[PDB]
Design a protein around this nucleic acid. Structure first.
Ligand code: ZN
Ligand code: ZN
Lengths: 188, 189
DNA sequence: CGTGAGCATGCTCAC
DNA sequence: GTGAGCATGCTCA
């Protein structure tokens, strides 16, 4: 997808380095099922009060783009809910008291929204912890299809203020697969 | 709880083997998902009328024996129904007009019973076609746990007249895995 | 119909 | 827990 730093210079950042690892040249996150991944939110200017941060997954390949990304039938019933996220949601937020799990009434896409909070004292960014509740390979779900996670900064009214994204692969061996995908990578 | 021929010499045989292939030394059937496997029903003397044949799967390993063998959530919902077999049943019967899919309300175990039919003209055994609707590897299902299929010959009152059983591995490459398991089995020293 | 090599990807098991 | 190697479904010459 195409980014939109917008008027507040909004963009993501990732801690360097397993259970979670980010590849810059690929701008792809590799992580294990249900493991927390910290994502940094950077702005050049403080967003208006009441701004929100939304996370959503969409299939990368054009031919799958219209299909809603949801958990596979096995994990959807594996009883591992936190009492807040609906079972069919792939993406969950950890360490936040006000998550909102939504489903678009038109597209039926799932998303989890959290309030935007300015960086703590001494920091240049604010961190949000995300979890993916299915592997990219789960049958009846992502089915080995790569996805993109779209992080959008919106105002209290739900208007787009900024947007960024990264590709993600939820798998058993993040470190192994990242290396495999980086050496198989061809540029131009 | 043990194979046994009974008053009718009831035992199983298998057309010999790939899609579907049996290994005598292993007494194990290696087949592909949803592919028909013909198993032969042998008897020393014809059993009474009203006799039926039931098929049931159970996990081989003791620490799994108590868990019901059923289809994984993905396949249970993958609309491949045939209009009769409940969607969660692993074993289905092919080419038989009236199979009966039951679920023991006490053990919750699935089984499919079919009426017993004497061999055709010029044959010594009767053949029943089964097929498995999940791979042994299905996550949420057998999850790589080996199962045993138990075929029982019972009369119209449900009384056991004989029993037999074989191991089964439903997989993508039956020939590759049969060879591997037979190779590994030879290592009994 | 019918072949076979290599790989993708969750799992298991020594050090 | 850390790297090696296996188990097992899929892709495609
Ligand atoms: Zn899943
Ligand atoms: Zn299955």
């Amino acid at each position: 997808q195409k980014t939109y730093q917008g008027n507040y210079g909004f963009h993501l950042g990732f801690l360097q380095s397993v259970m979670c690892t980010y590849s810059p040249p690929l701008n792809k996150l590799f992580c294990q099922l249900a493991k927390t991944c910290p994502v940094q939110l950077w702005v050049s200017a403080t967003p208006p009060a009441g701004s929100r941060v939304r996370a959503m997954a969409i299939y990368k390949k054009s031919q799958h783009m219209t299909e809603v990304v949801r958990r596979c039938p096995h994990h959807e019933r594996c009883s591992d809910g936190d009492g807040l996220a609906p079972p069919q949601h792939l993406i969950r937020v950890e360490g936040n008291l006000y998550p909102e799990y939504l489903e678009d009434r038109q597209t039926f896409r799932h998303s989890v929204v959290v309030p935007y909070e300015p960086p703590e004292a001494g920091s240049e960014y604010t961190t949000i912890h995300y979890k993916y509740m299915c592997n990219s390979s789960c049958m009846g779900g992502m089915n080995r299809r790569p996805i993109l996670t779209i992080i959008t900064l919106e105002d209290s009214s739900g208007n787009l203020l900024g947007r960024d994204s990264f590709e993600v692969r939820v798998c058993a061996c993040p470190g192994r697969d990242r290396r495999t995908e980086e050496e198989n990578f061809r540029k131009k």
